[PDB]
């Protein structure tokens, strides 16, 4: 742990794990700063214990809420899909499930495996969408879902408030989103960077993006 | 042919008959003896025009009157014509079963 | 005696886009009938010899037109009582404007995630949907999920038909039918609507006809020998359909949809 | 239609060609196992023709097994119950209906349809017939829902909800045991197509019946009986009593009873034509199940049915789940701890 | 009316000669222009095999 950040420091930061690195970075709790009131960090954590360690380091910073964007790779690592959802829903105030690297597997099938870790199914979630209301979990946390990673990342940034933290885990510094066989170019840092710029015009347009679904001015 | 049909009453709802369905009199009689599934029906007098548009052959109906309405309904349910009648086989150019 | 058994049957059914292609292969792409100078059939036209045969197979060989935008079949939309309107449980007035007027339908689908609280038919346009949302998600990323929150044209209807749960329709119609029973010209009329809807749903379940085939994606073309009026209607559909694919708008989709309605059943 | 053409050759032929009981069974079986289209009206009319031939044709075990299978598939449950009662009196009985698990296991579908509609009293009586025939409950009958409940407890009416169990459910254990590590898991993702997502809809023509609790069924039965009472008040129930209606039955005249007399004088209709399937097939037990006031649901009644039902399932080879026990000594006999 | 008279006599083969198929093959193509298919199937009374006639 801490080899990459220490190497960057030695050649030339958030959490107490970076204090050790200072005593002794792309995708390593990388803060995305655009002069806003909430922190946005992009990390490469894609394992149940990596996510648990990451979310416990965020909680010690004392944010008001933690908003986590997480997904699972397709065709591989089928055992962590329910595990990472249980961890995210018990450590994050709002959880946004999405697609990390579907490959040749359907993204809604992976999300169904993830939903099984908290006792849900895709059909039940879609039924709640028809009634335009997604209920909270047993612990009072919120879970939302969208199979398009670009939509889910930016919608989570739009849910940020004053003194919150938005954690975009899974990819980190990787710059590809594998769909089918093509490795389409996709950078998580750019999506967070661009969503912060245009979140102001979205709010003054009357749109309420506090949760799912959004409340447009012309919707009741 | 005018007096061989009954109309399933508006209150007769089941998985066998639907309300407003046109069924043969003999079929309705036989089902009544064997079931108590809300088989409620009244005799209806069908004019020879209306009786000719409620046959067992969509080909005969489509060649008689209102072809577009007949074919649109039959095509949506995959209706099958077993070619028992005479005009059905005349259209197909075969040998009539008589 | 034993009857000399003879079992012959013929059936009609709505045709899939795949079966339409299988008929032709064969795509007619030019509105040309015959060359002026050579007096020969124009290549890839309504009389193309590579599509229909040399100038007997021209009496039986079909072609097809690849529509850039899907169009509803006028038999199942306008001929009262409407089949599409009855199956979708929406009044034909609110559903005809989705085809021929400048309306848009929100939340056309229910089997994929959505995040906007829009629903129903919007006669106007959503103000934020024009600038703010496409800018926030970028245009390239917006086009992926655009036709999942609100759609327009006959294509929106086809998405509703394709996403219908026919077994849900039967149970919802039955419970609503009984609820009216426990409780004067509207109650009786609504009961007849529910019986037709559940009858329609049952036939789709036990057959191989898909309800989304009521919206045409491909347009079969009559063989040339049967059209030595119809030719002008075909050219009109091809002309506007080629115009629409050059632009790629909604006003042009109405022109394509209206032309197909004229070709299939005029006077409606 | 192939088999029905041969049947018509026999029905409208000479005396030595007339259909027998086996002939009706073959034609009924052809329609029940048709590949496409709705055939329930064809079967019901054939049944009426067979009943009209009672003086010469009587049913056997196969006739009732086919009719139970047909009405269950089309979810005409109340008619499947009538023919299952007649099937009980035949030795072998439920095994013939089981069909060795073929044709979507009609024995299990009958049990599932009774569970889905809250007809628990009928469901227990069905299990009694299976016991006397040495017939174990098939796995298709013991299918498990998402909340891990079976027919033992699916009609107690917190519906589609789990029980407390005294501890948190391990959803990762369920994920592994459902094939989540090898790609063999059942995904509950809605998809386009006319194929039901629920595995309990397999075998039915138009999906399984909607879930109705035992409490709703008793309430609905209670309302229907009083609707009949209100209908006869405007005009004791006598439904199915042919002898009573024959007594009341005893230009056509506009007056009803005068018209009935003219129908007999002109031989239009007489009391010899007044018979139902119950009285020509010797259904002496059906007068016990009709014209009686239904029993009102009580939570105590629901519990004792569940204890009886759970005992029958265990002694017939079924394993109720840990969730089923909590919803309802027997829990620990299965190796479960709360 | 001429068809009806022939049917009343039961002269099935005379009626077939006076009608003859191009009348039905052309009908199928015109129905295909409306996205409808009209298939003619023969079911064998011997082995129950379904044959799609070339129409």
Contact between residue A39 and residue A164 where contact means Cβ atoms under 8 Å apart = yes
D6, D192, D201: residue with CB nearest C162:
D192
β-sheet bridge partners, residue D300: none
C117, C129, C135: residue with CB nearest A198:
C135
- For A48-52, which contacts have Cβ atoms below 8 Å and span 24 or more sequence positions? A48/A80, A48/A83, A48/A84, A48/A87, A51/A84, A51/A87, A51/A88, A51/A169, A52/A87, A52/A91
Q: Please tell me which residue of chain C has the smallest CA distance to D211.
A: C171
| Four-point Cα dihedral C224, C229, C234, C237, nearest 10 | 180
β-sheet bridge partners, residue A31: A41
Query: Is E50 an interface residue toward D (CB < 8 Å)?
Result: no
Number of inter-chain CB pairs under 8 A, B vs E: 30
d(CA C215, CA A197): 42
DSSP state of D338: -
Which technique was the structure solved with, according to the deposited record?
cryo-EM
Spell out the alpha helix ranges (H) of chain C.
Answer: 17-24, 49-52, 74-77, 83-88, 92-100, 132-136, 139-149, 154-162, 166-182, 185-206, 230-247, 250-264
E29, E37, E43: residue with CB nearest C12:
E37
Minimal C-alpha gap between C31 and chain B (Å): 28
Query: What are A175's two structure tokens?
Result: 């710059």
Interface test with A, best of C136, C144, C147 (most A CBs within 10 A): C136
Contact between residue C261 and residue C243 where contact means Cβ atoms under 8 Å apart = no
Q: Give Cα separations from B72 to B76, C76, C78 (angstroms).
A: 6, 7, 12
Per DSSP, the residues of A95-153 read: EEEEEEE-BTS-HHHHHHHHHGGGT--HHHHHHHHHTT-----TTS-EEEE-S-HHHHH
Specify the DSSP element, H or E, that contains A94: strand A94-101
Residue owning tokens 């009206």? D41
Contact criterion met (CB < 8 Å) for D196 and C167: yes
Q: Please tell me which residue of chain E has the smallest CA distance to B98.
A: E10
d(CA A76, CA D158): 38
| ∠ Cα A29 A30 A32 (to 5°) | 130
Query: Is A205 an interface residue toward C (CB < 8 Å)?
Result: yes
In angstroms and rounded to an integer, the radius of gyration of the C-alpha atoms of chain A is 17
Residues after which a C–N gap over 2.5 Å breaks chain D: 235, 250, 328
Number of inter-chain CB pairs under 8 A, A vs C: 78
Contact between residue D312 and residue D132 where contact means Cβ atoms under 8 Å apart = no
Resolution limit in angstroms?
Answer: 2.5
d(CA D70, CA D65): 9
At a CB cut-off of 8 Å and minimum separation 6, what does A113 contact? A72, A78, A81, A82, D175, D180, D185, D187
Interface test with C, best of A122, A206, A216 (most C CBs within 10 A): A216
Q: Please tell me which residue of chain D has the smallest CA distance to E48.
A: D2
Neighbours of C57 (CB within 10 A): 10
CB within 8 Å of chain C, chain D residues 5-44: 5-6, 9, 36-38
Q: Give the residue among B36, B39, B49, B35 at the shortest CA–CA distance from B6.
A: B39
Q: Please tell me which residue of chain D has the smallest CA distance to B25.
A: D45
- For C163-166, which contacts have Cβ atoms below 8 Å and span 24 or more sequence positions? C163/C108, C163/C109, C163/C110, C163/C111, C163/D192, C164/C87, C164/C88, C164/C211, C165/D190, C166/C201, C166/C204, C166/C205, C166/C211, C166/D194
Specify the DSSP element, H or E, that contains C120: strand C120-122
Taking each helix axis from N to C end, the angle separating D21-32 and D40-52, rounded to the nearest 10 degrees, works out to 170
At a CB cut-off of 8 Å and minimum separation 6, what does D302 contact? D156, D214, D215
Query: What are C176's two structure tokens?
Result: 């609503």
DSSP state of C186: H
d(CA A84, CA A72): 9
Pairing of strands C104-106, C150-151: antiparallel
β-sheet bridge partners, residue B43: B6
d(CA C19, CA C25): 10
Minimal C-alpha gap between B92 and chain E (Å): 6
Q: Give the residue among A69, C82, C178, A218 at the shortest CA–CA distance from D210.
A: C178
- Alpha carbon B12 to chain centroid, angstroms: 18
At a CB cut-off of 8 Å and minimum separation 6, what does D102 contact? none
Chain E positions with Cβ closer than 8 Å to B: 3, 7, 10, 12-13, 15-16, 19-21, 23-24, 27, 31, 34, 36, 40
Q: Give the residue among C13, C15, C28 at the shortest CA–CA distance from C66.
A: C28
d(CA C182, CA C161): 31
Per DSSP, the residues of D121-183 read: HHHHHHHHHHHHTT-PPPTTTT---TTS--TTSSSSSSTT----TTS---HHHHHHHTTTTTT
Query: What are E40's two structure tokens?
Result: 């003619």
Q: Give the residue among C211, E52, C204 at the shortest CA–CA distance from D36.
A: C204
């Amino acid at each position: 742990n801490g080899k990459t950040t220490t190497t960057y420091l030695i050649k030339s930061l958030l959490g107490r794990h970076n204090i050790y690195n200072i005593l002794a970075v792309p995708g390593r709790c990388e803060l995305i700063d655009e002069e806003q009131a909430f922190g946005v960090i992009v990390d490469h954590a894609n394992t149940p214990d990596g996510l648990s360690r990451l979310l416990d380091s965020v909680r010690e910073l004392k944010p008001r809420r933690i908003i986590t964007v997480i997904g699972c790779a397709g065709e591989n690592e089928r055992g962590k899909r329910p595990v990472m959802t249980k961890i995210a829903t018990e450590k994050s105030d709002v959880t946004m499930l999405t697609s990390d690297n579907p490959g040749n597997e359907d993204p809604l099938d992976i999300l169904d495996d993830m939903l099984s870790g908290i006792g849900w199914t895709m059909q039940e979630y879609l039924k709640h969408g028809e009634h335009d209301y997604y209920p909270p979990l047993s612990n009072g946390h919120r879970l939302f879902l969208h199979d398009v990673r670009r939509v889910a990342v930016r919608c989570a940034v739009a849910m940020g408030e004053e003194g919150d933290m938005v954690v975009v885990a899974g990819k980190g510094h990787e710059s590809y989103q594998l769909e089918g066989d093509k490795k389409e170019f996709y950078d998580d840092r750019e999506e967070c960077r661009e969503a912060l710029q245009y979140v102001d015009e979205l709010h003054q347009a009357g749109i309420d993006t506090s949760e799912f679904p959004w409340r447009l001015p012309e919707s009741h | 042919q005018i007096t061989s049909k009954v109309l399933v009453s508006e209150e007769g709802m089941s998985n066998v008959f639907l309300p407003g369905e046109l069924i043969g009199l003999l079929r309705a009689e036989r089902t009544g003896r064997a079931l108590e599934e809300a088989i409620c029906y009244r005799a209806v007098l069908l004019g020879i025009t209306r009786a000719s548009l409620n046959t067992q052959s969509f080909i005969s109906e489509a060649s008689f009157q209102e072809t577009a309405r007949v074919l649109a309904k039959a095509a949506l349910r995959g209706r099958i014509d077993w070619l028992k009648g005479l005009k059905e086989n005349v259209v197909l150019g075969g040998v009539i079963p008589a | 005696m034993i009857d000399r058994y003879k079992h012959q049957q013929l059936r009609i059914g709505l045709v899939s886009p795949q079966q339409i292609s299988a008929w032709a292969t064969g795509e007619v792409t030019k509105p040309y009938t015959f060359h002026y100078k050579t007096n020969k059939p124009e290549k890839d036209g309504l009389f193309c010899e590579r599509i229909f045969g040399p100038i007997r197979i021209r009496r039986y060989q079909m072609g097809y037109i690849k529509l850039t935008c899907p169009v509803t079949h006028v038999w199942y939309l306008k001929r009262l009582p409407s089949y599409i309107a009855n199956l979708l449980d929406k009044p034909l007035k609110e559903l005809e404007g989705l085809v021929y007027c400048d309306f848009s339908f929100a939340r056309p689908i229910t089997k994929k995630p959505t995040f906007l609280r829009l629903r129903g038919s919007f006669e106007y346009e959503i103000q934020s949907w024009k600038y703010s949302i496409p800018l926030f998600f970028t245009t390239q990323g917006f086009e992926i999920f655009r036709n999942r929150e609100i759609s327009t044209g006959a294509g929106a209807i086809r998405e509703q038909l394709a996403d219908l749960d026919l077994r849900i329709i039967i149970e919802n119609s039955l419970v609503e039918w009984k609820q009216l029973g426990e409780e004067d010209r509207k109650i009786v009329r609504r009961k007849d609507f529910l019986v037709r809807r559940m009858e329609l749903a049952k036939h789709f379940i036990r057959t191989n006809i898909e309800p989304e085939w009521m919206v045409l994606c491909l347009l079969p073309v009559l063989p040339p020998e049967l059209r030595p009026d119809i030719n002008e209607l075909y050219r009109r559909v091809i002309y506007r359909n080629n115009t629409l694919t050059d632009l790629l708008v909604m006003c042009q989709e109405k022109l394509v949809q209206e032309a197909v309605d004229t070709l299939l059943d005029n006077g409606i | 239609e192939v088999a029905y053409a041969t049947f018509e050759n026999m029905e409208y032929g000479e005396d030595f060609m007339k259909p027998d009981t086996e002939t009706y069974n073959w034609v009924i079986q052809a329609y029940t196992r048709a590949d496409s289209y709705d055939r329930v009206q064809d079967v019901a009319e054939l049944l009426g023709m067979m009943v009209e031939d009672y003086k010469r044709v009587q049913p056997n075990v196969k006739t009732h097994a086919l009719l139970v299978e047909c009405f269950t598939k089309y979810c005409v449950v109340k008619e499947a119950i009538r023919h299952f009662r007649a099937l009980k009196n035949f030795e072998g009985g439920t095994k013939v209906l089981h069909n060795a698990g073929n044709f979507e296991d009609p024995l299990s579908l009958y049990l599932r349809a009774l569970c889905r509609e809250g007809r628990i009293v009928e469901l227990i009586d069905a299990l009694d017939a299976m016991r006397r025939d040495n017939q174990p409950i098939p796995p298709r009958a013991m299918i498990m829902s998402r909340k891990y409940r079976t027919l033992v407890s699916s009609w107690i009416e917190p519906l589609q909800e789990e029980a407390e169990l005294g501890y948190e459910i391990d959803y990762l254990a369920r994920y592994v045991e459902e094939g989540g590590l090898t790609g063999e898991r059942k995904r509950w993702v809605p998809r386009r197509g006319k194929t039901p997502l629920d595995p309990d809809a397999a075998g039915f023509i138009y999906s399984n019946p909607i879930e109705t609790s035992f409490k709703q069924r008793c309430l609905e039965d209670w309302k229907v009986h009083h609707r009949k009472l209100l209908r006869t008040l405007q005009s004791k129930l006598h439904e199915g009593d042919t002898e009573f209606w024959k007594r009341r039955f005893l230009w056509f005249p506009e007056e009803p009873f005068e018209a009935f007399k003219e129908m007999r004088e002109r031989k239009v209709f007489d009391v010899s034509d007044m018979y139902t399937i119950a009285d020509v097939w010797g259904w002496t037990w059906e007068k016990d199940f009709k014209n009686k006031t239904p029993r009102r649901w009580s939570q105590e009644w629901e519990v004792e049915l569940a204890i009886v039902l759970m005992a029958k399932v265990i002694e017939l080879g079924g394993v109720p789940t840990i969730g089923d026990c909590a919803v309802i000594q027997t829990t620990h006999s299965l190796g479960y701890a709360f | 009316m001429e068809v009806w008279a022939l049917e009343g006599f039961g002269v099935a083969h005379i009626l077939q000669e006076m009608l003859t198929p191009e009348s039905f093959r052309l009908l199928v193509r015109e129905l295909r222009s409306l996205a409808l298919e009209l298939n003619h199937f023969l079911v064998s009374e011997k082995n129950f095999q379904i044959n799609r006639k070339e129409v």
